[PDB]
mmCIF file of C-alpha atoms and ligand atoms in Angstrom:
data_model
loop_
_atom_site.group_PDB
_atom_site.id
_atom_site.type_symbol
_atom_site.label_atom_id
_atom_site.label_comp_id
_atom_site.label_asym_id
_atom_site.label_seq_id
_atom_site.Cartn_x
_atom_site.Cartn_y
_atom_site.Cartn_z
ATOM 1 C CA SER A 30 0.353 -0.225 0.386
ATOM 2 C CA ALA A 31 1.289 3.590 -0.918
ATOM 3 C CA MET A 32 0.181 4.420 2.706
ATOM 4 C CA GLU A 33 2.178 1.567 4.307
ATOM 5 C CA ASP A 34 5.296 2.740 2.289
ATOM 6 C CA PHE A 35 4.912 6.457 3.657
ATOM 7 C CA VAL A 36 4.953 5.417 7.466
ATOM 8 C CA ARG A 37 8.106 3.486 6.569
ATOM 9 C CA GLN A 38 9.792 5.868 4.203
ATOM 10 C CA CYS A 39 8.919 9.708 6.911
ATOM 11 C CA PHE A 40 8.803 7.308 10.446
ATOM 12 C CA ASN A 41 12.185 6.335 12.000
ATOM 13 C CA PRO A 42 12.467 2.670 12.158
ATOM 14 C CA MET A 43 11.993 2.911 16.513
ATOM 15 C CA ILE A 44 8.675 4.363 15.728
ATOM 16 C CA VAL A 45 7.558 1.898 13.205
ATOM 17 C CA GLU A 46 8.471 -0.873 15.829
ATOM 18 C CA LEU A 47 6.823 0.935 18.166
ATOM 19 C CA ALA A 48 4.133 1.251 16.260
ATOM 20 C CA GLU A 49 3.497 -2.494 15.266
ATOM 21 C CA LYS A 50 3.845 -3.580 18.742
ATOM 22 C CA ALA A 51 0.848 -0.827 19.788
ATOM 23 C CA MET A 52 -1.091 -2.225 16.657
ATOM 24 C CA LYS A 53 -0.993 -6.203 17.991
ATOM 25 C CA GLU A 54 -1.402 -4.941 21.433
ATOM 26 C CA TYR A 55 -5.171 -4.358 20.190
ATOM 27 C CA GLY A 56 -4.520 -7.203 17.176
ATOM 28 C CA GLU A 57 -4.789 -4.669 13.964
ATOM 29 C CA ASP A 58 -3.545 -5.158 11.338
ATOM 30 C CA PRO A 59 -1.155 -2.121 9.690
ATOM 31 C CA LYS A 60 -1.259 -2.871 5.838
ATOM 32 C CA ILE A 61 -5.135 -2.981 6.446
ATOM 33 C CA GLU A 62 -5.682 -0.035 8.943
ATOM 34 C CA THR A 63 -2.686 1.940 6.846
ATOM 35 C CA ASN A 64 -4.563 4.956 8.641
ATOM 36 C CA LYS A 65 -4.511 4.375 11.452
ATOM 37 C CA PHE A 66 -0.419 2.771 11.402
ATOM 38 C CA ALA A 67 0.491 6.729 10.229
ATOM 39 C CA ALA A 68 -1.391 8.184 13.695
ATOM 40 C CA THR A 69 -0.001 6.043 15.476
ATOM 41 C CA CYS A 70 3.597 6.286 14.575
ATOM 42 C CA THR A 71 2.743 10.294 14.588
ATOM 43 C CA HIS A 72 1.445 9.962 18.354
ATOM 44 C CA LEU A 73 4.521 8.539 19.218
ATOM 45 C CA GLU A 74 6.849 11.256 17.342
ATOM 46 C CA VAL A 75 4.689 13.588 19.160
ATOM 47 C CA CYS A 76 4.962 12.007 22.218
ATOM 48 C CA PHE A 77 9.019 11.949 22.307
ATOM 49 C CA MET A 78 9.264 15.346 20.519
ATOM 50 C CA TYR A 79 7.303 16.322 23.698
ATOM 51 C CA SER A 80 9.693 14.427 25.898
ATOM 52 C CA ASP A 81 13.062 15.843 24.453
ATOM 53 C CA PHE A 82 12.338 18.953 26.137
ATOM 54 C CA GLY A 83 13.553 18.607 29.837
ATOM 55 C CA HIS A 84 15.291 14.782 33.106
ATOM 56 C CA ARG A 85 11.660 16.819 32.757
ATOM 57 C CA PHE A 86 9.091 14.534 31.306
ATOM 58 C CA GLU A 87 8.736 10.784 31.179
ATOM 59 C CA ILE A 88 7.579 8.747 29.106
ATOM 60 C CA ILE A 89 4.757 6.059 29.380
ATOM 61 C CA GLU A 90 3.632 6.729 25.763
ATOM 62 C CA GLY A 91 5.272 3.771 23.588
ATOM 63 C CA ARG A 92 6.548 1.192 26.815
ATOM 64 C CA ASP A 93 4.580 -2.255 26.857
ATOM 65 C CA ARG A 94 1.764 -1.993 28.881
ATOM 66 C CA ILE A 95 3.204 -3.345 31.904
ATOM 67 C CA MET A 96 7.189 -1.858 32.129
ATOM 68 C CA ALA A 97 3.756 1.724 31.396
ATOM 69 C CA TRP A 98 1.844 1.672 34.258
ATOM 70 C CA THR A 99 5.363 0.466 36.069
ATOM 71 C CA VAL A 100 6.685 3.283 35.624
ATOM 72 C CA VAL A 101 2.836 5.479 36.712
ATOM 73 C CA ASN A 102 3.107 3.410 39.875
ATOM 74 C CA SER A 103 6.248 4.581 40.378
ATOM 75 C CA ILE A 104 5.526 8.061 39.502
ATOM 76 C CA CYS A 105 2.183 8.012 42.151
ATOM 77 C CA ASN A 106 4.366 6.508 44.933
ATOM 78 C CA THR A 107 6.883 8.778 44.705
ATOM 79 C CA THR A 108 5.059 12.098 43.901
ATOM 80 C CA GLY A 109 1.500 11.230 46.330
ATOM 81 C CA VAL A 110 -0.203 12.694 42.342
ATOM 82 C CA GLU A 111 -3.124 10.726 42.010
ATOM 83 C CA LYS A 112 -2.701 7.227 40.057
ATOM 84 C CA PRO A 113 -5.411 8.255 36.331
ATOM 85 C CA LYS A 114 -8.299 5.011 35.362
ATOM 86 C CA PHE A 115 -6.255 4.971 32.279
ATOM 87 C CA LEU A 116 -2.730 4.845 30.994
ATOM 88 C CA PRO A 117 -1.156 8.938 30.166
ATOM 89 C CA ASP A 118 1.315 9.634 27.744
ATOM 90 C CA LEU A 119 3.633 11.583 29.880
ATOM 91 C CA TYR A 120 5.111 12.939 33.248
ATOM 92 C CA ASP A 121 5.458 16.164 33.996
ATOM 93 C CA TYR A 122 8.091 16.686 36.860
ATOM 94 C CA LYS A 123 8.226 20.350 36.772
ATOM 95 C CA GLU A 124 4.602 21.312 36.781
ATOM 96 C CA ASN A 125 4.093 17.662 38.358
ATOM 97 C CA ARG A 126 0.726 16.008 36.552
ATOM 98 C CA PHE A 127 -0.032 13.436 33.915
ATOM 99 C CA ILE A 128 -0.363 14.300 30.531
ATOM 100 C CA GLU A 129 -2.538 12.729 27.888
ATOM 101 C CA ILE A 130 -0.985 14.128 24.273
ATOM 102 C CA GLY A 131 -3.990 14.248 21.355
ATOM 103 C CA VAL A 132 -3.287 14.620 17.822
ATOM 104 C CA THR A 133 -6.384 15.411 15.343
ATOM 105 C CA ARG A 134 -7.401 15.894 12.127
ATOM 106 C CA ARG A 135 -10.391 17.246 13.769
ATOM 107 C CA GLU A 136 -10.728 20.460 14.803
ATOM 108 C CA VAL A 137 -8.993 21.183 17.949
ATOM 109 C CA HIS A 138 -11.954 21.403 20.573
ATOM 110 C CA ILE A 139 -14.006 18.964 19.101
ATOM 111 C CA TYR A 140 -10.568 16.152 20.252
ATOM 112 C CA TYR A 141 -10.923 18.400 23.167
ATOM 113 C CA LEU A 142 -14.133 17.069 24.436
ATOM 114 C CA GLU A 143 -13.991 14.529 23.847
ATOM 115 C CA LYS A 144 -10.655 13.396 25.258
ATOM 116 C CA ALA A 145 -11.229 15.414 28.855
ATOM 117 C CA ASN A 146 -14.821 13.716 28.485
ATOM 118 C CA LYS A 147 -13.137 10.456 28.444
ATOM 119 C CA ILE A 148 -10.348 10.876 30.542
ATOM 120 C CA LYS A 149 -12.800 12.187 33.550
ATOM 121 C CA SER A 150 -10.004 13.129 35.254
ATOM 122 C CA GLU A 151 -9.465 16.376 36.493
ATOM 123 C CA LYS A 152 -6.009 16.402 37.410
ATOM 124 C CA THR A 153 -4.010 14.966 33.911
ATOM 125 C CA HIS A 154 -3.361 17.757 31.796
ATOM 126 C CA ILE A 155 -4.294 17.282 27.712
ATOM 127 C CA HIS A 156 -2.747 18.912 25.279
ATOM 128 C CA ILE A 157 -4.303 18.385 21.531
ATOM 129 C CA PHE A 158 -2.524 19.477 18.558
ATOM 130 C CA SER A 159 -3.949 19.072 14.742
ATOM 131 C CA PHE A 160 -2.362 19.676 11.391
ATOM 132 C CA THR A 161 -3.307 22.813 10.889
ATOM 133 C CA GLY A 162 -0.417 24.206 13.675
ATOM 134 C CA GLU A 163 -3.540 23.994 16.291
ATOM 135 C CA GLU A 164 -3.367 23.423 19.936
ATOM 136 C CA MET A 165 -5.762 23.338 22.852
ATOM 137 C CA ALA A 166 -4.705 22.408 26.568
ATOM 138 C CA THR A 167 -6.817 22.151 29.869
ATOM 139 C CA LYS A 168 -6.638 25.750 31.920
ATOM 140 C CA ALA A 169 -5.257 26.938 28.387
ATOM 141 C CA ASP A 170 -1.364 25.810 30.221
ATOM 142 C CA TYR A 171 0.981 24.852 27.198
ATOM 143 C CA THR A 172 3.198 23.345 29.199
ATOM 144 C CA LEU A 173 6.150 23.458 26.640
ATOM 145 C CA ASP A 174 7.648 26.795 25.450
ATOM 146 C CA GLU A 175 6.341 28.644 22.110
ATOM 147 C CA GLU A 176 9.772 26.938 20.413
ATOM 148 C CA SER A 177 9.256 23.295 21.328
ATOM 149 C CA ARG A 178 5.544 23.739 20.116
ATOM 150 C CA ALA A 179 6.756 25.194 17.288
ATOM 151 C CA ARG A 180 8.720 22.165 15.993
ATOM 152 C CA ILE A 181 5.773 20.080 17.055
ATOM 153 C CA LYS A 182 3.585 21.967 14.598
ATOM 154 C CA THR A 183 5.718 22.661 12.129
ATOM 155 C CA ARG A 184 6.648 18.332 12.394
ATOM 156 C CA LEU A 185 2.938 17.808 11.806
ATOM 157 C CA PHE A 186 2.682 19.714 9.578
ATOM 158 C CA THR A 187 4.968 18.465 7.380
ATOM 159 C CA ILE A 188 3.502 15.471 7.672
ATOM 160 C CA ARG A 189 -0.008 16.258 6.375
ATOM 161 C CA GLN A 190 2.215 17.555 3.509
ATOM 162 C CA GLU A 191 3.765 14.815 3.234
ATOM 163 C CA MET A 192 0.886 12.881 2.357
ATOM 164 C CA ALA A 193 -0.628 15.332 0.055
ATOM 165 C CA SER A 194 1.504 14.575 -1.922
ATOM 166 C CA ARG A 195 1.096 11.278 -2.094
ATOM 167 C CA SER A 196 -2.834 11.471 -2.333
ATOM 168 C CA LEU A 197 -3.127 10.719 0.784
ATOM 169 C CA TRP A 198 -4.077 13.094 2.953
ATOM 170 C CA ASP A 199 -8.027 12.926 2.228
ATOM 171 C CA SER A 200 -8.606 9.245 3.066
ATOM 172 C CA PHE A 201 -6.229 9.483 6.144
ATOM 173 C CA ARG A 202 -7.759 13.339 7.371
ATOM 174 C CA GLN A 203 -11.764 11.581 6.571
ATOM 175 C CA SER A 204 -10.308 8.071 8.596
ATOM 176 C CA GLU A 205 -10.061 9.176 12.947
HETATM 177 MN MN1 LIG B 301 -1.177 6.683 25.504
HETATM 178 MN MN1 LIG B 302 -3.033 10.404 23.420
#
């Protein structure tokens, strides 16, 4: 498929392999669910980017469930922050809060409402990125400095334009 080929062209091997591991964790073939494959790669890369801005962040996303919950439990035991219902994506050691990262092909406010309604925790900070350079965060606290958020938004927009150059963006954006 063209979408699978794009995913292997634009993401680094480590990210692709982690994404395939996740797809198997919910029993999904990346050769069939190619838009989910690309979305999974994109979310992984954003989380790793977000974390590289420390030191400051602990990455939970990209780990197997056992190690992810091991990290979460160790953090909660050393900080007293309460355990989230659902696996978050990062832990911010400076603000001392868990962060759930969203990347959406829709309006940032719609996806923010969806994520907030799901997690149902006033403790887990939400930060939504779009492929159009838009962002929305809990209490409009964007956590990072503008340069770091700028590099995330540039990478996301670049992924979108590469898809578009291969006529893959319309499929990807209409998929959820
Ligand atoms: Mn996650
Ligand atoms: Mn997320």
